[PDB]
Design a protein around this ligand. Sequence first.
Ligand SMILES: *[C@@H]1O[C@H](CO)[C@@H](O[C@@H]2O[C@H](CO)[C@@H](O)[C@H](O)[C@H]2NC(C)=O)[C@H](O)[C@H]1NC(C)=O
Ligand SMILES: *[C@@H]1O[C@H](CO)[C@@H](O[C@@H]2O[C@H](CO)[C@@H](O)[C@H](O)[C@H]2NC(C)=O)[C@H](O)[C@H]1NC(C)=O
Ligand SMILES: [Ca+2]
Ligand SMILES: [Ca+2]
Lengths: 236, 237
Amino acid sequence: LDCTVIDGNLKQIDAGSGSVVGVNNLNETFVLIDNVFTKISGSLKHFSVGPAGQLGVNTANNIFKYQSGGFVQLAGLLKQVDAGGDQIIAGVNMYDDIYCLNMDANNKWPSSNTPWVQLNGKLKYYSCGPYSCWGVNSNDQIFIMKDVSSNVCSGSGSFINIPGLLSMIEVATDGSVFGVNSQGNLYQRTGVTRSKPDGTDWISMVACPNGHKHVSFDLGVLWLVCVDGSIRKCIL
Amino acid sequence: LDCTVIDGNLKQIDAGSGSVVGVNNLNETFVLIDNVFTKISGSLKHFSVGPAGQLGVNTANNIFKYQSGGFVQLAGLLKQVDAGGDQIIAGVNMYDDIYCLNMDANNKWPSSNTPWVQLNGKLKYYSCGPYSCWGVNSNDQIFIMKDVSSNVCSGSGSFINIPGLLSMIEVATDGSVFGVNSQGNLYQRTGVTRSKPDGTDWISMVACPNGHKHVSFDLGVLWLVCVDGSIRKCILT
Ligand SMILES: *[C@@H]1O[C@H](CO)[C@@H](O[C@@H]2O[C@H](CO)[C@@H](O)[C@H](O)[C@H]2NC(C)=O)[C@H](O)[C@H]1NC(C)=O
Ligand SMILES: *[C@@H]1O[C@H](CO)[C@@H](O[C@@H]2O[C@H](CO)[C@@H](O)[C@H](O)[C@H]2NC(C)=O)[C@H](O)[C@H]1NC(C)=O
Ligand SMILES: [Ca+2]
Ligand SMILES: [Ca+2]
C-alpha cells in the first residue's frame, strides 16, 4: 500500500466518526488534532472512538468515557472496549467474557445503574460496526455477531465462526473489517455488506515494512501501528 | 440550574457524544480539551458534534467534516448543520430549505457526491436526536419531525407544530430538548420520551444573569452561551 508516515509512537490506535485516537506503551492518551497526535490527560491501555463516544480502559480494567471536558469513570471492568457500534459500547473483560451496553443506557448520565448485557461466548478482543460486531478468541479464531442494533446490542445472540486466524480485529463505520494476525500480517475482509455481513474472503495488504501491530479504519483511511510503534496513514 | 463559568467567549456551542465544541464571533473554532476551550484550525460560523461526527459550516455556507486529522469539504451549502442524530446529518440553507444525510452516505468516503435528502418545508434551525429532530422557522414557530431513523433521515415526512416561540433549539443524545427565544429566555421541553416525543410543556430556567444566546445539552450537562458571549456549564436540579 501507499502510506505516509506520521509522527508519534503508539501501541494501539482506533479511528471512527472522523476521529483518530490511541495510546502509547506508557499508557499516555492521544487524539489526532490538526494532523498531530496530541497528548491529553489520562492513563489508558486502550482508547477507542466512534459513534458511541470516546471510551477507554486503564491498567486496572476500569472503564472511562470522555464527557464534558474530561474522562469520567463508568461502572464495570473491561480489558478492551470499542465505541464503533451504533451508539452501543462493547468489550471484553479479564476472563474473556463479552459485554455490551445499549444506546439508551450509554446516553443516560448521571446513571443509577450501568446495565451491561453479557453475550454468550469467550473473546479476547471485540469491535462493533453499523450492523454487526466482530471479535477473536484466545486461540485467534474469528467470530461475527449479526443483527446488532442500537438497543439490541447483543444482536442475534449467537456467534458465527469465520474461517481464519487474527489477533485483533476492527469494524469501521462503513462496515469495513480489518485485522492483524499473530505473525504481524494485515488483512481486510472483502464482500462485506448489510446483506452479507460475514463477507466472502480475506485479502492481504502491506502498510508496514517489518510487521503490523494494530489496525483501524475510518472514512477511507487505514491507520497502522507498526511493530516498532511507528504510525502509518494509508489513504485507500 | 447549578452552573460554573468556563473561561472564553463564543457565539455558538454544541455538545454531543461526550464532546463540546463551538465557534467565537471571529469564527475561530474550539474543542473542549481537558476543561479548556482549545482552538483548532478552521473558520466556521457553526460547529456541531454528536453521533454523526464533527460538522461545521463557514461564512460562505460551505460544509466541512472533521476526518482523519482535519476538515474536509463536503458537497452542498448550509447555514447551520447538526450532528446529533443517529449517524445522520441535518441542517438548513440560506433560503431555509431543510436537508438530511442518511447514515450510509455519511459514512461513505471517498464520495464524489454528498446525497442530501430535502425535507418539505422551511426552517432556519434544525437539530436531531435519537428518534426525532426539532427545528424553528423564521417566525420562531417550533416543529418536530418524528420517527427519524439512520437510513430514513426524513422521518414521517409530517412536521408537527409545537406551540411556543424559539429562535434556536437543540436535541440531545438522551432525547432532551432545550431552546432559546428571541428575548434571550431559556426553556426545556418537559415530558419528552420515546412514548411522547413531543413532550408536554415548556419550562423557563436561567443560567445566564445577562440573558441567553445559545444552548446545547449532553450527558447531564447543559451548556450556555450568554448574550455577552460568556459560557455557563450547568447541571440540572
Ligand atoms: C501500561 O498498561 C499496561 C497494561 O495494563 C501495563 O502492563 C501491565 O501491568 C500489569 C501490572 O500493573 C501486569 O499485570 C501486566 O502483566 C502488564 N501487561 C503488559 C502487557 O505488560 C503497563 O505496566 C502500563 N505502563 C505504564 C507505564 O503505566
Ligand atoms: C464570522 O462569520 C459571520 C457570519 O458569516 C460574519 O458576519 C457576516 O459577514 C458577512 C460578510 O462576509 C455579512 O454579509 C453578514 O451580514 C454578517 N453576518 C452577521 C450575522 O454579522 C463575520 O464577519 C465573520 N467574522 C470573521 C472574523 O470571519
Ligand atoms: Ca473501533
Ligand atoms: Ca447538537
